[PDB]
Chains A and B, each alone.
Chain A
Amino acid sequence: GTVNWSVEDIVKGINSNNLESQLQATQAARKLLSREKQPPIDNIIRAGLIPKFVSFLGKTDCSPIQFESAWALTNIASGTSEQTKAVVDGGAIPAFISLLASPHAHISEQAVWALGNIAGDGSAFRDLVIKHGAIDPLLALLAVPDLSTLACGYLRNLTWTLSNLCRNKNPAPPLDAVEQILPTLVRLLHHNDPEVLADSCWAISYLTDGPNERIEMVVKKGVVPQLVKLLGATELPIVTPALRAIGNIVTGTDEQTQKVIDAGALAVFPSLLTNPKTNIQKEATWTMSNITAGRQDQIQQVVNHGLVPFLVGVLSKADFKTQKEAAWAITNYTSGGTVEQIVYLVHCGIIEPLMNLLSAKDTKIIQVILDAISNIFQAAEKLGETEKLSIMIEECGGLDKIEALQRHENESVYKASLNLIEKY
Chain B
Amino acid sequence: TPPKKKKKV
Contacts and interface: CB of A to CB of B under 8 A. Distances in A.
Interface of A: 34, 36, 39, 71, 74-75, 77-79, 84, 110, 113, 116-117, 120-121, 160, 163-164, 167, 198-199, 202
Chain B interface secondary structure, helix, strand, loop or mixed?
Answer: loop
Interface of B: 1-9
A78 B6 CA distance: 6
B9 A117 contact: no
A202 B1 CA distance: 7
Chain A interface secondary structure, helix, strand, loop or mixed?
Answer: helix
Contacts of B7: 34, 39, 74-75, 78
Given A78-B8, A110-B8, 5 more contacts: A75-B8, A77-B5, A116-B5, A120-B4, A160-B2
Contacts of B8: 34, 71, 74-75, 78, 110, 113
B9 A36 contact: yes
B3 to A, nearest CB: 8
Contacts of B3: 120
Contacts of B1: 202
Contacts of A160: 2, 6
A163 B6 contact: no
Nearest to A30: B8
30 contacts: A34-B7, A34-B8, A34-B9, A36-B9, A39-B7, A71-B8, A74-B7, A74-B8, A77-B5, A78-B5, A78-B6, A78-B7, A78-B8, A84-B5, A110-B8, A113-B8, A116-B5, A116-B6, A120-B4, A120-B5, A121-B4, A121-B5, A160-B2, A160-B6, A163-B2, A164-B4, A167-B4, A198-B2, A199-B2, A202-B2
B5 to A, nearest CB: 4
